[PDB]
Amino acid sequence: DPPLQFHSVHGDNIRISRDGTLARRFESFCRAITFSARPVRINERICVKFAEISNNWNGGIRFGFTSNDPVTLEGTLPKYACPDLTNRPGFWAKALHEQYCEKDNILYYYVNGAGDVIYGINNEEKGVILTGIDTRSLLWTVIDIYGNCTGIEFLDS
Template sequence: MTAVLDQFMEFHSVHGTNVQLDPSRTRATRVESFANGVCFSKDPLSPGEIFLVEIEEKELGWCGHLRIGLTAHDPRTLDTVPEYSLPDLVEKGDSWVFAITRNHNKVTEDEGAEVEQPNEGNDTSNKPKTFFTDTHLYIENMGIPRDKLVGRSRPGRFSHILDDLYKTNALPPTARRSRIGVVYVPKGEGCANMHIVINGEDMGASAKRIPTNKPLYAVVDVFAATKCVRIVQVEYGFASLQTLCRKTIQKHIVHRMALDWLELPELLKHYCKYE
């Protein structure tokens, strides 16, 4: 089942004291220190709706990286925004946060735990990743359009090589331009599992049996070595004409840098290169 959702994602006006939002509220920058970088989604997420961010800037000298998750706390009801998502926000209860690391982000089932059978069409264990042909990433029975999930390098001489490294998750998830998202999928009556998605790959259920009796907001902690993130809008339902044009053009070129050789408007070239 594919979620049909089209809300424009923004960061909430309530955030950590060291966070600065751009006028569109889609870019969050930690302007000093390494903490007080906690942000929230403006609106609660729906089941199967991913809150996706791209790492835009990093800052050397700090230990730790982006943290992402969910909270049932309405940001407007918080007396103060916690300095850290881990452990401060989590210790308030009704919050589930996952710390992204350079390695070992994939969640494995405990030995002896019941292993769920994959849904039809979702058995990816014995077949290669098909980033170019699969239109959706399926988590349980929820489908997320794959088009925007994978990070892209800056256009340049070696960008065709770097793009392939993002697609196969060969680069560290904490690298610039990596795309990291959080989503929850229903699991029975009144509960859900939280999944982290890194460059188009599901990392597994990082939190299980989350109560869904309250609205769930995304949490993004712009922490330590992660200095700036921007929201990537994921299109559900019918794609825009702009997106359809981009997809058609990209089908017929070897690599996006080949756009420079085409007689196309500069704005369209820019959109195809960066998105």
């Protein structure tokens, strides 16, 4: 439907912009978990821009999907998507290589009918990063704003 926004259920170290399109890890190095405000479609491309980078932290963001309505998760969020959420049923996420986490890159990803998650950077496919996603339930993005990237923007095309 409408352009993707961040869910109001998020980590303690996250601030979301007024229009809901920009999530920042405002302090520290963890508790940086975020979700999409609405479920996403199979084959819908999620496009995220690395809007802000800190030179004081290293590492890549973690991204993927959850079959859990983020409202059901409030007061329940751990420090990390990996391993902490991924250990629970209905979360699929992996780290993005830190070489891709540079200012103004666009990460795109989607889950296909087969339940595989394909990703790329600046419109160049990198491949399948995740497999076995439950395509029979509603899915929300999970993006853990970990590492040198401290601000990410959902892009509207």
